[PDB]
Amino acid sequence: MLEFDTIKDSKQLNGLALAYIGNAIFEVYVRHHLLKQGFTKPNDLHKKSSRIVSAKSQAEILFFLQNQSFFTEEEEAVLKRGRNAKSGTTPKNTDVQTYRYSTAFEALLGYLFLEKKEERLSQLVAEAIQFGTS
């Protein structure tokens, strides 16, 4: 992964900053994966990343993982904090609860990354990409 340092009071970030960094994390992972799979055309890389980085696919991946008995107590608390955060303007072509349920996923990824829980985040996004691409 990258070479960062810890940020003081990383257990007190609201549900929004976590998703703010987690969106970037997920973008990095999915782009590196699509590039590793073998592709050069930026048009096709966008047309494909916009299949896994949409709120619909994210809510779907979240429901799939959750219904598979994958998480633990603290990840459940981080999910509830991500989904309970109320702000923003809903996108014009989506529901307003799948939005919340995808923000929960991004908050989970961000909180996992901001605590140096590297391998768990790695395997989680591995299974997420594997599902989404299938």
Partner 1 sequence: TKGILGRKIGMTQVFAENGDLIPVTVIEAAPNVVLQKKTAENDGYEAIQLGFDDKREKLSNKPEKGHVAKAETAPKRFVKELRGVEMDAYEVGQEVKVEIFSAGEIVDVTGVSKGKGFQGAIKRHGQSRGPMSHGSRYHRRPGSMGPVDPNRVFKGKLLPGRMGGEQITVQNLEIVKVDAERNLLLIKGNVPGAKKSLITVKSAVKS
Q: Kindly list the residues in this chain that would bind RNA in the complex (CB under 7 A).
A: 14-15, 40-41, 63, 66-67, 77, 80-81, 83-86, 97-98, 100-101
Residue 29 vs 55, nearer CB to RNA:
55
Token readout for 23 is: 């969106």
Q: Are 114 and 21 in contact (CB under 8 A)?
A: yes
Residue type, 52: I
Q: How many CB atoms lie within 10 A of CB 48?
A: 17
In the region spanning residues 64 to 83, those forming contacts with partner 1, defined by CB under 8 A, are none
Residue 14 vs 122, nearer CB to RNA:
14
Residues that bind its own copies (CB under 8 A): 1-5, 7, 13-17, 20-21, 24-25, 27-28, 31-32, 35-36, 39-42, 45, 87-88, 118, 122
